[PDB]
Write an enzyme that holds these catalytic residues in place. Structure first.
Site, mmCIF file in Angstrom:
data_model
loop_
_atom_site.group_PDB
_atom_site.id
_atom_site.type_symbol
_atom_site.label_atom_id
_atom_site.label_comp_id
_atom_site.label_asym_id
_atom_site.label_seq_id
_atom_site.Cartn_x
_atom_site.Cartn_y
_atom_site.Cartn_z
ATOM 1 N N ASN A 1 10.036 4.267 2.681
ATOM 2 C CA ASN A 1 10.243 3.506 3.973
ATOM 3 C C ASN A 1 11.411 2.778 4.209
ATOM 4 O O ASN A 1 12.280 2.378 3.477
ATOM 5 C CB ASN A 1 8.724 2.436 4.058
ATOM 6 C CG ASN A 1 7.546 3.029 3.040
ATOM 7 O OD1 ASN A 1 7.236 3.914 3.884
ATOM 8 N ND2 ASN A 1 6.657 2.861 2.449
ATOM 9 N N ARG B 1 1.213 -0.978 -0.299
ATOM 10 C CA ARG B 1 0.010 0.035 -0.066
ATOM 11 C C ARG B 1 1.364 1.896 0.135
ATOM 12 O O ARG B 1 0.906 2.225 -1.052
ATOM 13 C CB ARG B 1 -1.145 -0.075 1.170
ATOM 14 C CG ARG B 1 -2.120 0.978 1.218
ATOM 15 C CD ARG B 1 -2.165 2.437 1.604
ATOM 16 N NE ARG B 1 -0.964 2.588 1.878
ATOM 17 C CZ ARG B 1 -0.738 4.203 2.556
ATOM 18 N NH1 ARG B 1 -0.988 4.421 1.779
ATOM 19 N NH2 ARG B 1 -0.031 4.228 4.171
ATOM 20 N N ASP B 2 1.545 1.450 1.072
ATOM 21 C CA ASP B 2 2.437 2.938 1.024
ATOM 22 C C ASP B 2 3.271 2.754 0.249
ATOM 23 O O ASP B 2 3.731 3.549 -0.820
ATOM 24 C CB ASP B 2 3.010 2.837 2.837
ATOM 25 C CG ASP B 2 3.558 4.408 2.988
ATOM 26 O OD1 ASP B 2 4.625 3.818 3.608
ATOM 27 O OD2 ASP B 2 3.687 5.278 3.097
ATOM 28 N N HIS C 1 10.877 7.162 7.864
ATOM 29 C CA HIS C 1 11.481 7.324 6.729
ATOM 30 C C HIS C 1 12.878 7.206 5.932
ATOM 31 O O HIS C 1 14.015 7.757 7.076
ATOM 32 C CB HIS C 1 10.755 8.236 5.875
ATOM 33 C CG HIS C 1 9.533 7.842 5.258
ATOM 34 N ND1 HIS C 1 8.521 9.220 3.628
ATOM 35 C CD2 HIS C 1 8.408 7.044 5.485
ATOM 36 C CE1 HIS C 1 7.671 8.569 4.126
ATOM 37 N NE2 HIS C 1 6.858 7.116 5.164
ATOM 38 N N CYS D 1 8.088 9.890 -0.734
ATOM 39 C CA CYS D 1 6.961 10.970 -0.401
ATOM 40 C C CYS D 1 7.122 12.117 -1.533
ATOM 41 O O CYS D 1 8.109 12.529 -2.112
ATOM 42 C CB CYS D 1 7.958 11.658 1.136
ATOM 43 S SG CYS D 1 6.618 12.350 1.887
ATOM 44 N N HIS E 1 6.684 4.055 12.083
ATOM 45 C CA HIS E 1 7.031 4.495 10.371
ATOM 46 C C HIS E 1 7.635 5.341 10.153
ATOM 47 O O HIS E 1 6.843 6.742 10.368
ATOM 48 C CB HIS E 1 5.325 5.030 10.313
ATOM 49 C CG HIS E 1 5.005 4.108 8.641
ATOM 50 N ND1 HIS E 1 4.037 4.116 7.939
ATOM 51 C CD2 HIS E 1 6.345 5.280 7.518
ATOM 52 C CE1 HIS E 1 4.068 3.984 6.899
ATOM 53 N NE2 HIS E 1 5.507 4.912 6.947
HETATM 54 O O1 LIG Z 1 -2.978 8.253 3.007
HETATM 55 C C1 LIG Z 1 -1.926 8.452 2.038
HETATM 56 O O2 LIG Z 1 -0.807 8.375 2.792
HETATM 57 C C2 LIG Z 1 -2.605 9.410 1.021
HETATM 58 C C3 LIG Z 1 -3.647 9.482 0.666
HETATM 59 O O3 LIG Z 1 -4.343 8.558 0.580
HETATM 60 C C4 LIG Z 1 -3.410 9.185 -0.918
HETATM 61 C C5 LIG Z 1 -3.777 10.716 -1.293
HETATM 62 O O4 LIG Z 1 -2.235 11.774 -1.047
HETATM 63 O O5 LIG Z 1 -4.565 11.620 -1.540
HETATM 64 MG MG LIG Z 2 5.819 5.481 4.515
#
Ligand SMILES: O=C(O)CC(O)CC(=O)O
Ligand SMILES: [Mg+2]
Ligand SMILES: [Mg+2]
Lengths: 296, 296
Positions: free
Chosen positions: A248, A14-15, A208, A239, A206
């Site tokens: 990450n 995801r991230d 970076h 980022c 978390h």
């Molecule tokens: O939660 C995030 O890390 C990013 C968002 O969901 C997506 C966005 O930048 O609109």
């Molecule tokens: Mg991250």
């Protein structure tokens, strides 16, 4: 003292994939996730039920959550930025969702025109909906160690927002150094303030590695007693608010350190390296994990 | 707790360059060292007085030492393996020399060919001569946190070698994780055994980032009171005992951490980055400094 066991939260699918330049097909995502499950990770952030018009890289969120193998005991939390996404996530079978806020006023406003206080009203609706459905909610507090707009962030302020998340229903809050500008002293001060108001078990870190401080900041957190840390497979991610450097903390470099410390993670390094190599090839990129580079 | 100030020992022009694929002209080395002097480093390992047979990358050692500007206050130590190397170093104007041992037996056999005990006879003559010559000497103990041949290395054996070096004349002993396999706990046990026998002010740490553990192992040493750590400009170098992975801890990433901790280093980060960029270009490589990648 150091915890005896650390729960590693894998955020690569995801991230990581969300902030990667190239995109992979749905089958690759599902395969990557089944591979991390096979590697023994206990929680894997799977996707995000966000509008395809805003972040297309997560557009297949419904089919990914339904296609992955659901290993016994393993959690597959999903991001749900609003009520509409929360309802879709639940309908797709999600049992845990994740909401995200920030400890920075400037960051929140440039990301939703709402103040930190206002952002919590949008969260209350989801948390009320999640409670009625017996669904767990994890919270993300960005800019915990610095903001790209405000610069330094007050520990008290991070403690304030984290407390709000926790009293509102989140069983766990992840304090994120979103741009990677933090250093151990800053990590130390922040956690010290947060722990005054929130029990140690509800906290996760978390970090970076944008400035190469990820692992050192994580160790400070571990020395402070935090027992859950977020990381991404091969250091995938990045980022949007920082020059195209890294993103990450690499899960392999983290487990390598934890195994050295004698700390239980229940993760199989060899199989984790396979997952990392797999997704890296699908993405046509070099892994950001040093352990992977040193192993072969 | 953390020391108020840290002496950063820059090894890029010697350790870094000696272990790089491509080589550079004598004028490039000279300029690199002058740029490192410009950035404010207080000690810069300049070159090694060893035969071109073994390592040709260090052949220009004489002209390099004579050609670099000597900034007020800055030290420019050089390596001198045998008594003949030490001879040339003195003549070339060296005011500080470096002798390198190892806590690993097998390692001393692959490196120079003899028993850890025998290697002490050689060091004695040099130390003896160095004393007559009025030259300060620094020691290097390799495989301090593990060896690529013996594997685990005991803190006792490391404490033994460091002690031998210290009582034999060395005013500072640099303990090095040459293969970068160490983790925080191993670093702590090692430092702990060594500190029993040698005063803290005479200790230095030198960690490779091959497995991404360098900055963390360094943080542990600082927490233990060590106040001098070695690092290479843009993460220059690499371990001949492993895959194609990073080598020395990158100096820019380390000062960023120290500056973050409010620890005095006296180093100008921007000029340090200029130096890093300069050499990477001459080497036709990409910097291994995360900070460099994030700054631009
Ligand atoms: O939660 C995030 O890390 C990013 C968002 O969901 C997506 C966005 O930048 O609109
Ligand atoms: Mg991250
Ligand atoms: Mg080295």
């Amino acid at each position: 003292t150091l915890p005896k066991r650390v729960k590693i939260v894998e955020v690569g699918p995801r991230d990581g994939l969300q902030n990667e330049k190239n995109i992979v097909s749905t089958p690759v995502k599902i395969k990557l996730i089944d591979m991390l499950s096979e590697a023994g990770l206990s929680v894997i952030e799977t996707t995000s039920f966000v509008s395809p018009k805003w972040v297309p890289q997560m557009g297949d969120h419904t089919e990914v959550l339904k296609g992955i193998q659901k290993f016994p005991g393993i959690n597959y939390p999903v991001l749900t930025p609003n009520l509409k996404g929360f309802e879709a996530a639940v309908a797709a079978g999600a049992k845990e969702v994740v909401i995200f806020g920030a400890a920075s006023e400037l960051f929140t406003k440039k990301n939703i025109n709402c103040s930190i206080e206002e952002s919590f009203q949008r969260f209350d609706a989801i948390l009320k909906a999640a409670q009625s459905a017996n669904i767990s909610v994890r919270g993300y507090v960005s800019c915990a160690l610095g903001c790209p707009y405000e610069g330094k962030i007050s520990p008290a302020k991070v403690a304030e927002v984290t407390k709000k998340f926790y009293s509102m229903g989140c069983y766990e809050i992840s304090l994120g150094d979103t741009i990677g500008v933090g250093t151990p002293g800053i990590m130390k001060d922040m956690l010290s303030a947060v722990m005054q108001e929130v029990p140690l078990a509800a906290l996760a870190v978390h970090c970076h590695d944008t400035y190469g401080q990820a692992l050192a900041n994580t160790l400070m957190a571990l020395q402070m007693g935090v027992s859950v840390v977020d990381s991404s497979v091969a250091g995938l991610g990045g980022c949007p608010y920082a020059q195209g450097a890294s993103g990450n903390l690499a899960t392999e470099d983290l487990v390598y350190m934890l195994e050295g410390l004698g700390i239980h993670t229940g993760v199989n390094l060899q199989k984790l390296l396979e997952a990392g190599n797999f997704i890296c090839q699908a993405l046509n990129r070099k892994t950001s994990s040093k352990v992977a580079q040193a192993t072969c």
